[PDB]
Motif scaffolding. Sequence first.
Motif, PDB file in Angstrom:
ATOM      1  N   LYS B  18      31.269 -87.554  37.426  1.00 59.89           N
ATOM      2  CA  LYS B  18      30.719 -86.248  37.126  1.00 59.89           C
ATOM      3  C   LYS B  18      29.402 -86.442  36.379  1.00 59.89           C
ATOM      4  O   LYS B  18      29.326 -87.170  35.390  1.00 59.89           O
ATOM      5  CB  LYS B  18      31.741 -85.382  36.373  1.00 59.89           C
ATOM      6  CG  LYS B  18      31.318 -83.915  36.109  1.00 59.89           C
ATOM      7  CD  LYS B  18      30.457 -83.783  34.817  1.00 59.89           C
ATOM      8  CE  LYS B  18      29.659 -82.484  34.814  1.00 59.89           C
ATOM      9  NZ  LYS B  18      29.266 -81.999  33.435  1.00 59.89           N
ATOM     10  N   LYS B  27      18.461 -76.250  31.813  1.00 56.34           N
ATOM     11  CA  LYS B  27      19.295 -75.024  31.660  1.00 56.34           C
ATOM     12  C   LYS B  27      18.526 -73.696  31.542  1.00 56.34           C
ATOM     13  O   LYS B  27      18.829 -72.731  32.256  1.00 56.34           O
ATOM     14  CB  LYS B  27      20.236 -75.131  30.433  1.00 56.34           C
ATOM     15  CG  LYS B  27      21.608 -75.812  30.632  1.00 56.34           C
ATOM     16  CD  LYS B  27      22.503 -75.447  29.426  1.00 56.34           C
ATOM     17  CE  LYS B  27      23.453 -76.574  28.999  1.00 56.34           C
ATOM     18  NZ  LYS B  27      22.992 -77.338  27.768  1.00 56.34           N
ATOM     19  N   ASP B 180      24.792 -86.552  28.027  1.00 55.67           N
ATOM     20  CA  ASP B 180      23.569 -86.802  27.273  1.00 55.67           C
ATOM     21  C   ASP B 180      23.851 -87.349  25.868  1.00 55.67           C
ATOM     22  O   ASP B 180      23.021 -87.262  24.975  1.00 55.67           O
ATOM     23  CB  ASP B 180      22.654 -85.556  27.260  1.00 55.67           C
ATOM     24  CG  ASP B 180      23.176 -84.426  26.373  1.00 55.67           C
ATOM     25  OD1 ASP B 180      24.377 -84.380  26.024  1.00 55.67           O
ATOM     26  OD2 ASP B 180      22.356 -83.563  26.027  1.00 55.67           O
ATOM     27  N   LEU B 206      34.089 -82.688  17.063  1.00 55.35           N
ATOM     28  CA  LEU B 206      33.143 -81.879  17.824  1.00 55.35           C
ATOM     29  C   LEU B 206      32.447 -80.826  16.977  1.00 55.35           C
ATOM     30  O   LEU B 206      33.055 -80.218  16.096  1.00 55.35           O
ATOM     31  CB  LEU B 206      33.818 -81.211  19.012  1.00 55.35           C
ATOM     32  CG  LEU B 206      34.728 -82.150  19.776  1.00 55.35           C
ATOM     33  CD1 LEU B 206      35.446 -81.392  20.852  1.00 55.35           C
ATOM     34  CD2 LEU B 206      33.945 -83.328  20.329  1.00 55.35           C
ATOM     35  N   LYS B 221      34.834 -80.768  28.040  1.00 57.52           N
ATOM     36  CA  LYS B 221      34.758 -82.151  28.469  1.00 57.52           C
ATOM     37  C   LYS B 221      35.980 -82.937  28.026  1.00 57.52           C
ATOM     38  O   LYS B 221      36.619 -83.577  28.829  1.00 57.52           O
ATOM     39  CB  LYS B 221      33.476 -82.799  27.960  1.00 57.52           C
ATOM     40  CG  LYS B 221      33.061 -84.009  28.763  1.00 57.52           C
ATOM     41  CD  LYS B 221      31.696 -84.564  28.344  1.00 57.52           C
ATOM     42  CE  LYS B 221      30.560 -83.564  28.522  1.00 57.52           C
ATOM     43  NZ  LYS B 221      30.374 -83.124  29.934  1.00 57.52           N
TER      44      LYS B 221
HETATM   45  N1  LIG Z   1      31.385 -85.222  18.478  1.00 56.02           N
HETATM   46  C1  LIG Z   1      30.444 -85.100  19.438  1.00 56.02           C
HETATM   47  N2  LIG Z   1      29.881 -86.162  20.047  1.00 56.02           N
HETATM   48  C2  LIG Z   1      28.920 -86.030  20.988  1.00 56.02           C
HETATM   49  N3  LIG Z   1      28.436 -84.854  21.418  1.00 56.02           N
HETATM   50  C3  LIG Z   1      28.942 -83.705  20.902  1.00 56.02           C
HETATM   51  C4  LIG Z   1      29.990 -83.779  19.863  1.00 56.02           C
HETATM   52  N4  LIG Z   1      30.294 -82.526  19.525  1.00 56.02           N
HETATM   53  C5  LIG Z   1      29.508 -81.699  20.256  1.00 56.02           C
HETATM   54  N5  LIG Z   1      28.716 -82.410  21.067  1.00 56.02           N
HETATM   55  C6  LIG Z   1      27.782 -81.803  21.988  1.00 56.02           C
HETATM   56  O1  LIG Z   1      28.292 -81.994  23.290  1.00 56.02           O
HETATM   57  C7  LIG Z   1      27.195 -82.136  24.177  1.00 56.02           C
HETATM   58  C8  LIG Z   1      27.727 -82.743  25.485  1.00 56.02           C
HETATM   59  O2  LIG Z   1      28.207 -81.709  26.353  1.00 56.02           O
HETATM   60  P1  LIG Z   1      27.172 -80.921  27.264  1.00 56.02           P
HETATM   61  O3  LIG Z   1      25.956 -80.364  26.565  1.00 56.02           O
HETATM   62  O4  LIG Z   1      27.981 -79.862  27.921  1.00 56.02           O
HETATM   63  O5  LIG Z   1      26.789 -82.110  28.298  1.00 56.02           O
HETATM   64  P2  LIG Z   1      26.768 -82.063  29.910  1.00 56.02           P
HETATM   65  O6  LIG Z   1      27.935 -81.266  30.401  1.00 56.02           O
HETATM   66  O7  LIG Z   1      26.834 -83.495  30.344  1.00 56.02           O
HETATM   67  N6  LIG Z   1      25.347 -81.292  30.505  1.00 56.02           N
HETATM   68  P3  LIG Z   1      25.212 -79.557  30.524  1.00 56.02           P
HETATM   69  O8  LIG Z   1      26.610 -79.132  30.840  1.00 56.02           O
HETATM   70  O9  LIG Z   1      24.155 -79.173  31.498  1.00 56.02           O
HETATM   71  O10 LIG Z   1      24.860 -79.155  29.107  1.00 56.02           O
HETATM   72  C9  LIG Z   1      26.227 -83.002  23.367  1.00 56.02           C
HETATM   73  O11 LIG Z   1      24.870 -82.869  23.825  1.00 56.02           O
HETATM   74  C10 LIG Z   1      26.455 -82.506  21.940  1.00 56.02           C
HETATM   75  O12 LIG Z   1      25.604 -81.423  21.613  1.00 56.02           O
END
Ligand SMILES: Nc1ncnc2c1ncn2[C@@H]1O[C@H](COP(=O)(O)OP(=O)(O)NP(=O)(O)O)[C@@H](O)[C@H]1O
Lengths: 268, 268
Positions: B18, B27, B180, B206, B221
């Motif tokens: 994924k 976005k 990311d 989180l 996720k």
């Molecule tokens: N403990 C954590 N560790 C890492 N990231 C975290 C945590 N808590 C929150 N996040 C957020 O979770 C994000 C990852 O999910 P997300 O932004 O949905 O990524 P993505 O699904 O791969 N791309 P998109 O869905 O287009 O935003 C990171 O960029 C952080 O802002």
Amino acid sequence: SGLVPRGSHMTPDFLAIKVGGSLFSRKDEPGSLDDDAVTRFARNFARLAETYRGRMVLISGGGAFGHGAIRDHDSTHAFSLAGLTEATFEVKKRWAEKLRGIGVDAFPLQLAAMCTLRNGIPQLRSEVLRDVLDHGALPVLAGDALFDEHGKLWAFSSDRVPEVLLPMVEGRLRVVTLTDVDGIVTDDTILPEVDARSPEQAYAALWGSSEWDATGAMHTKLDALVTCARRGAECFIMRGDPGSDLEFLTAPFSSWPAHVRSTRITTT
Amino acid sequence: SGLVPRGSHMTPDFLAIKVGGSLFSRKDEPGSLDDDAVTRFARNFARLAETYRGRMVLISGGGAFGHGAIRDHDSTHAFSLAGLTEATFEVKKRWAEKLRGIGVDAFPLQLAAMCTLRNGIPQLRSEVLRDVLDHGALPVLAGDALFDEHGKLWAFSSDRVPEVLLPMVEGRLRVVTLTDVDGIVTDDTILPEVDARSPEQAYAALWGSSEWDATGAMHTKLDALVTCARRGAECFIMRGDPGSDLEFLTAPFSSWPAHVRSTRITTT
Ligand SMILES: Nc1ncnc2c1ncn2[C@@H]1O[C@H](COP(=O)(O)OP(=O)(O)NP(=O)(O)O)[C@@H](O)[C@H]1O
Ligand SMILES: Nc1ncnc2c1ncn2[C@@H]1O[C@H](COP(=O)(O)OP(=O)(O)NP(=O)(O)O)[C@@H](O)[C@H]1O
Ligand SMILES: C[C@@H]1O[C@@H]1P(=O)(O)O
Ligand SMILES: C[C@@H]1O[C@@H]1P(=O)(O)O
Ligand SMILES: [Mg+2]
Ligand SMILES: [Mg+2]
């Protein structure tokens, strides 16, 4: 499961409306869509969709998109046809997008995700279609690239989409294929009725296109409707016109207005 | 049907990869797609796809399209969400179109045509996915607007697509979610391993987005991967980079190269 009364007096229980690509898209013009025509057809389909809520599908012709994506595919890798699925999804979107704009719960469904070919007979393999209809929504469907049992892709015209409904629809199915002729022309003169148990004269009348048609023009049209009609459907070939009122398509064929030209295909 | 050996020594039998929207799409920028990133990711996915022929799915994030179509939908008609299906099909197309260009049999499939929600558990309801894989093809999938048992649409993130594979995949499933961040960050420091039977510390870590995320960022996720892992999958959160070689994703986790940062989620 039971005895179903059928006749020119009876009211259909399900509407499968198929609209020809040529009526809204110029085949030899990449990406073309007559928005005015879509808007106006959509508006007539929507009135039908409200009456036949959960008892109707709209099936779109492929137009420039569908005929285009078949034209261009390399024949030596069967898998190049996969473009056709992305192509006919584009047209489903346009209809659904438009129909939702005037208050219809229109949902586009990808036939290739729902249906495979098994000895040439298309097989519905997803329960989702039945469910969407049960929810009262309007499935917007189209032809597609379908996998057969060996993994090879085949181009499957919107004209044959109604065949997929046959084992699913209880009661009276009506198939109306809106086209750029008034029906099957024989002799300067349109054939009013065809018996699907012996369609000889109907098949005898077809001519060959100017070579420009990837999905078999009137021949595939008649094949599909003859197939549906042998399975009970009441089937029609008639001219689509974007401004034409279609409220009579909910009515018994006996009580259809004056001077409507069509070819009707039934299993007497 | 039987006993399946599982472990850091074992080689996965199925790859669900994924890729986050944010890694290829901005976005808050309507219609945006980093083609260079798609091209380069596609090229790395294709090498995996050849190894895992009929044993792999690529799942795309929605990016501008998917997050866009949720942002804009009127909340008072659940059915406005139908736009999301047309939106995430657009992204599947881009991947398939690209992957076919470099010789991959990539076929986009519309999840909404294959899967419904039944008490919140997504239900695969189409045999087509299993068939496409059996044909040796590469399904390109994505999140979608899914119908529940009452006919209401719900936004279903690409992150949960792997859950749909669980009852279908025999043997060892590996889920890799390219994102990311390097994994779940706790304390300035990434959590290397999470036991899906008690993910407390992982959930504790989180943080909330800046309000900009329609599908729940890291929380959804972790939910998805915790769900898969409780059902046997080996699951990973790691940074996607379009130029990163991913050949090691076919390898036992024991024999992964040096200094790869990830969070691994397993049911010990
Ligand atoms: N403990 C954590 N560790 C890492 N990231 C975290 C945590 N808590 C929150 N996040 C957020 O979770 C994000 C990852 O999910 P997300 O932004 O949905 O990524 P993505 O699904 O791969 N791309 P998109 O869905 O287009 O935003 C990171 O960029 C952080 O802002
Ligand atoms: N006996 C016949 N009567 C009427 N039309 C016929 C006959 N034989 C061949 N045709 C051709 O069949 C065509 C109708 O099929 P076709 O061109 O496929 O319409 P369509 O599917 O509604 N739109 P498109 O698929 O975009 O071309 C007519 O335009 C005629 O050229
Ligand atoms: C499937 C290819 O578009 C053609 P038709 O469905 O309009 O026949
Ligand atoms: C389904 C909406 O696009 C989001 P995601 O799948 O990228 O979470
Ligand atoms: Mg035609
Ligand atoms: Mg996300």
